[PDB]
Amino acid sequence: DRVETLVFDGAKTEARAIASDIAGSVGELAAAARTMSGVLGRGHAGQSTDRAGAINLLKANLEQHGFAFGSWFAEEPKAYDGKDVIDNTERGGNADGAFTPYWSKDRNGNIQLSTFKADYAAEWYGLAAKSGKGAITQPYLAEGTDVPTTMTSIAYPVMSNGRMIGVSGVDISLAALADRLSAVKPFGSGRVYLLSQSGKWLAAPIPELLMKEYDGEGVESVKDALSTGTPRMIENLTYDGNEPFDRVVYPFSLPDVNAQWLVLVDVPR
């Protein structure tokens, strides 16, 4: 159809715009995470930074990049400095007794020093540690944040003389993503959303959908778009009665973290 084709093109053109903005923001944070992983690693190799200073330096990633919700480092057990660590949040000690510093934002938009559990099998640690390369997580509810907040994490292995000593990473709150999708505008009576590597909701119509897997109308096309990496269009779906619209899905590779996301662009009839 010449109408549906034009809707498909216009939505594609705008999804292309949205994807390069998200991909750019992501790639820039990934670079800041990888840099931090380096200075934490080299600072360990040459005893240029103690455990106290590692916390000092870790705050730089939030002061310089507003799009990062938090900056953290989970240390392989006893790896950093081997000192006793039980419960000293000002020195990166969790209840488990492990070096886990965490700078994050609180409810009022200020920076606080938190601490988290060393869940080595968790995506934010396992992915980067098993591949040896930078990685990005499926959306998950963060623990060490002041207020519970749903975020995705870009994590990199921290190396010290050819042996890894832990994982450092940066966070993108699911709200920050939602904000960007309104800073660069929707279709005008058009809404844009965002799916994760596996089709989980990163930016959704209602917040109840976040972190859940897509199973609305046109689900198979989402799975097929995710495979081919090419765009699909779900025709005529209804948030019921009121105005029906088309759902265009637009995969796009994220720069350094070995993953792709879907832009969803909703255009009403």
Ligand X SMILES: C[N+]1(C)CCC[C@H]1C(=O)O
When binding is defined by CB under 6 A, the residue of 25, 49, 61, 145 that contacts ligand X is 145
Per CB under 6 A, 101 contacts ligand X: no
Per CB under 6 A, 72 contacts ligand X: yes
> Closest Cα partner for 264 from 237, 243, 173, 139?
237
Mask: binding to ligand X, 167-206, rule CB under 6 A, as x and -?
----x-----------------------------------
Between vectors from CA 81 to CA 78 and to CA 83, what angle results, nearest 5°? Answer: 75
Question: Residue 193 corresponds to which amino acid?
Answer: Y
E strand or H helix at 264, and its extent?
strand 259-268
Per CB under 6 A, 93 contacts ligand X: no
Per CB under 6 A, 153 contacts ligand X: yes
Rounded to the nearest whole angstrom, what is the least distance from the CB of residue 197 to ligand X in the complex? 18
Binding residues for ligand X, rule CB under 6 A, total: 11
When binding is defined by CB under 6 A, the residue of 124, 245, 250, 261 that contacts ligand X is 124
Per CB under 6 A, 116 contacts ligand X: yes
- Residue closer to ligand X by CB (options 145, 160) is 145
When binding is defined by CB under 6 A, the residue of 70, 92, 93, 218 that contacts ligand X is 70
Per CB under 6 A, 73 contacts ligand X: no
Mask: binding to ligand X, 204-233, rule CB under 6 A, as x and -?
------------------------------
Rounded to the nearest whole angstrom, what is the least distance from the CB of residue 202 to ligand X in the complex? 16
254, β-bridge pairs: 259
The stretch among 7-15, 43-51, 139-147, 199-207 that binds ligand X (CB under 6 A) is 139-147
- DSSP class per residue in 138-187: PPEEESSSSS-EEEEEEEEEEEETTEEEEEEEEEEEHHHHHHHHHHS---
Distances in Å between the alpha carbon of 176 and those of 47, 52, 56, 188?
Answer: 36, 30, 25, 21
- Residue closer to ligand X by CB (options 125, 214) is 125
> Closest Cα partner for 18 from 251, 258, 211?
251
Rounded to the nearest whole angstrom, what is the least distance from the CB of residue 71 to ligand X in the complex? 9
The stretch among 53-61, 83-91, 138-146, 219-227 that binds ligand X (CB under 6 A) is 138-146
Per CB under 6 A, 142 contacts ligand X: yes
Asked if 71 and 93 touch (Cβ cutoff 8 Å), the reply is no
Separation CA 185–CA 265 (nearest Å): 11
Residue 104 gets the label, from left (phi > 0), alpha (psi -120 to 50) or beta, of beta
Separation CA 239–CA 245 (nearest Å): 9
CA trace torsion 128, 129, 130, 135 (10° rounding): 0
When binding is defined by CB under 6 A, the residue of 144, 157, 166, 231 that contacts ligand X is 144
Q: Which stretches of the chain bind ligand X, using CB under 6 A?
A: 70, 72, 102, 116, 124, 142-145, 153, 171
